[PDB]
Amino acid sequence: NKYKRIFLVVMDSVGIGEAPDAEQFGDLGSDTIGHIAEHMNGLQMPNMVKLGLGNIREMKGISKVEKPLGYYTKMQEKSTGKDTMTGHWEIMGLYIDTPFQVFPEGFPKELLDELEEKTGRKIIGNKPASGTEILDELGQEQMETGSLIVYTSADSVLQIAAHEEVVPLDELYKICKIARELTLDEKYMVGRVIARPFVGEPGNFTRTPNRHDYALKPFGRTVMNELKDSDYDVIAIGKISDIYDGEGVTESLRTKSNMDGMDKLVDTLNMDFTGLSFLNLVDFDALFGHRRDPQGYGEALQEYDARLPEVFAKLKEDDLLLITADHGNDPIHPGTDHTREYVPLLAYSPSMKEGGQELPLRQTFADIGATVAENFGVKMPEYGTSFLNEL
Ligand SMILES: O=P([O-])(O)O[C@H]1O[C@H](COP(=O)(O)O)[C@@H](O)[C@H](O)[C@H]1O
Ligand SMILES: [Mn+2]
Ligand SMILES: [Mn+2]
Ligand SMILES: [Mn+2]
C-alpha cells in the first residue's frame, strides 16, 4: 500500500464558489470562502495557503504559492442534492439521485396528518426553531395536552419534543420510528428524525440526554464499508459516524467543537492504525453558515488554520492528508440553506519531497472514495476516478 494511513478532513460547508449548476438551486453568486475573505478584509489562513488553497483560487488574503506543499484542485458535486448526507455519501463512493429536503416553512400537512393518524396525538409547532425557543413557547401546552411538538432546523431534520413525565420515553421513541418510516418518501425526505425529550416546569424546561437519532443508511455500500470488511481501521471523528449511520465505522470519537475535532485528529495521528481517520469539522456549517455570520465563520477558519502546523509535524512519510468540504453554506446569501458550490481539495504527504501540482478538476466527490479504495486495495466504488497515481 502507498499510504498506511489516510487522514480525511471535511471542513463542513467550506465551499469555494458557485458550481456550474448553482442556478437550479437559486445559488447564483454563492461563494463561501470568497465572501468570508471579503468580509474579513483578507482571511488569515497561512497554512492552507502553504498547502495550495490560493493555487485553487485566489481570494482576499489567500494568494497562490510557487511551491505548494501538496496537490490541489476543486471538486464538483454530481449528486442531485446539496445536503450533508448527499455530500458525504458521494465522497465515500456513492451517487445520490434523491435529495434530502429542508423545511423553512414547516412540514407539509399531508405528512403531519399521517403522523397524527398513526399515533393518535395532536401535533403543534411545525416550524424551524431552536430547542430552547420552541420549549419556551410550546412546552406548557405540550404538557397539558399530550400533543407532540414537531419542529425543524436549517438542516434536513424532523425533531419531536415531548415531556418525559407526560409522554413516556419508550412512547416518544415509538412515535419517532413511525415518523422515520413516513419520511422515507421523496415528497418529504428528512435526513434525520430526532427524539427531543425534555423535563422541568414552565419557564425552566431542559432537554435531557435521552435524545435519540433516527438516521438513514447510505444508499449503497460505501468505501468505508469495504475498508471495514477488509479489516482496516475506520476511525470516525465528530459527526462522521452519524452521517453514515455507523456504516463501515470501526471506532467513533465524539467532538464538542472544531478545536476538539482537531484534538481528536491529533489523537488519531498518535494511534498505530492502518486505514482511514475521517474528521468532520461541523462548526462552520452549524454555527456560522446557517446563522449567516461571516465574522464568526472567518474567525473559525483562522482558528482551524492555526492548528495545522502540528498536524504537518506529526504526519509520517506513509501518511496522506486530504482536506475538502461537502457543499457550500455562504454566510452572505439569502435564506438559511446550503449553497451549491465547488469544494476545495488538498492532498498532502511529507513524502511529496518536491511539493505538489494541480490535479485535474474532480468531476464527482467520489474521486476521494476511489482514491482511498485504490490505496488500500479494496473493491473500487461504482463512481469516482482515483487520483492516487497523480500524487
Ligand atoms: O445537536 P446536534 O449537534 O446533534 O444537531 C442537531 O440539532 C441541531 C439543533 O440544535 P438546537 O435546537 O439545540 O439549536 C440542528 O441544527 C441539527 O441539524 C441537528 O442535527
Ligand atoms: Mn441559495
Ligand atoms: Mn455539511
Ligand atoms: Mn447544514
From Swiss-Prot:
SUPFAM superfamilies, alphabetized: Alkaline phosphatase-like, DeoB insert domain-like
Single Gene Ontology MF annotation: phosphopentomutase activity
EC number(s) reported in the record: 5.4.2.7
Residues the entry annotates as binding Mn(2+) 2: 285, 290, 338
Cofactor: Mn(2+)
Pfam families the UniProt entry points to: Metalloenzyme
Record's catalysed reaction(s): 2-deoxy-alpha-D-ribose 1-phosphate = 2-deoxy-D-ribose 5-phosphate; alpha-D-ribose 1-phosphate = D-ribose 5-phosphate
Entry's Gene Ontology BP terms: 2-deoxyribose 1-phosphate catabolic process; 5-phosphoribose 1-diphosphate biosynthetic process; metabolic compound salvage; nucleotide metabolic process
InterPro entries (UniProt xref): Alkaline_phosphatase_core_sf (IPR017850), DeoB (IPR010045), Metalloenzyme (IPR006124), Phosphopentomutase_DeoB_cap_sf (IPR024052)
Residues noted as binding Mn(2+) 1 in the record, renumbered to the chain: 12, 326-327
UniProtKB keywords: Cytoplasm, Isomerase, Manganese, Metal-binding
Broad class of where this protein is predominantly found: cytoplasm
UniProt superkingdom: Bacteria
GO CC terms in record: cytosol
Pathway per the UniProt entry: Carbohydrate degradation; 2-deoxy-D-ribose 1-phosphate degradation; D-glyceraldehyde 3-phosphate and acetaldehyde from 2-deoxy-alpha-D-ribose 1-phosphate: step 1/2
Cofactor note: Binds 2 manganese ions.
UniProt subcellular location: Cytoplasm
Family label: Belongs to the phosphopentomutase family.
Annotated PANTHER family: PHOSPHOPENTOMUTASE
Reported function: Isomerase that catalyzes the conversion of deoxy-ribose 1-phosphate (dRib-1-P) and ribose 1-phosphate (Rib-1-P) to deoxy-ribose 5-phosphate (dRib-5-P) and ribose 5-phosphate (Rib-5-P), respectively.
The protein's name: Phosphopentomutase
